[PDB]
Design a protein around this ligand. Structure first.
Ligand SMILES: NC(=O)c1ccc[n+]([C@@H]2O[C@H](COP(=O)([O-])OP(=O)(O)OC[C@H]3O[C@@H](n4cnc5c(N)ncnc54)[C@H](OP(=O)(O)O)[C@@H]3O)[C@@H](O)[C@H]2O)c1
Ligand SMILES: Cc1nc(C(F)(F)F)c(C(=O)O)cc1-c1nc(-c2ccccc2)cs1
Length: 160
């Protein structure tokens, strides 16, 4: 059993605002699919609500949604009341959002982090990325360009 986290952040650490992600990076969809396809994905209820209906649930993955609400209906996902209840498959990828990343970081042995070269100053209410300590090791990838006009790069980090 392992847990990984996968997220994208601006250089400020902002990952979400107003119930959405404040940029688009279409080229990174392949990476997101390569990492998560065929595995369990776990997300917070707000992130589930943010998915367009076309990809709710995300196809080819076992979708799990965390909520404290008894009998919340998430058609296409299994709703659980604790993160630990979701960790039943060999590989579980936490796909957001801010609250669930913070909850899951202690359990994680991999982080796949896309850094987007955009200023995006923090504002009240923003969802923020977690911070990795010195227990993690890995590499920072080369800069890639997105047709959106932004450059981005991948940090692939891991620990025992
Ligand atoms: N890579 C990215 O940039 C990225 C990827 C994913 C999401 N996002 C963005 O992140 C934002 C959402 O993040 P968020 O922090 O506001 O919300 P979130 O983590 O997606 O969901 C929070 C909700 O999860 C449930 N939950 C949280 N902690 C729980 C715990 N111990 N036990 C049981 N259930 C728990 C609660 O649901 P209930 O209220 O139903 O109890 C909580 O209200 C959005 O802007 C999204 O677009 C960004
Ligand atoms: C349009 C879309 N399309 C595809 C598909 F089907 F086209 F590949 C996929 C896929 O399969 O990973 C995924 C999405 C989206 N993901 C998010 C999202 C948002 C937050 C966290 C994780 C994913 C939004 S919109």
């Amino acid at each position: 059993t392992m847990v990984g986290l996968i997220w994208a952040q601006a250089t400020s650490g902002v990952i979400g605002r107003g119930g959405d992600i404040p940029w688009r990076l279409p080229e990174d969809q392949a990476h997101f699919r390569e990492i998560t396809m065929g595995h369990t994905i776990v997300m917070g209820r707000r992130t589930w609500d943010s998915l367009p209906a076309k990809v709710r649930p995300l196809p080819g993955r076992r979708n799990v949604v965390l909520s404290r609400q008894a009998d919340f209906m998430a058609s296409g996902a299994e709703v659980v009341g604790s993160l630990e209840e979701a960790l039943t498959s060999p590989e579980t990828w936490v796909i957001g959002g801010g609250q669930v990343y913070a909850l899951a970081l202690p359990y994680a042995t991999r982080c796949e982090v896309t850094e987007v070269d955009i200023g995006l100053p923090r504002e009240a209410g923003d969802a923020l990325a977690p911070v990795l300590d010195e227990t993690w090791r890995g590499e920072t990838g080369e800069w890639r360009f997105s047709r959106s006009g932004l450059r981005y790069r991948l940090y692939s980090y891991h620990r025992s």
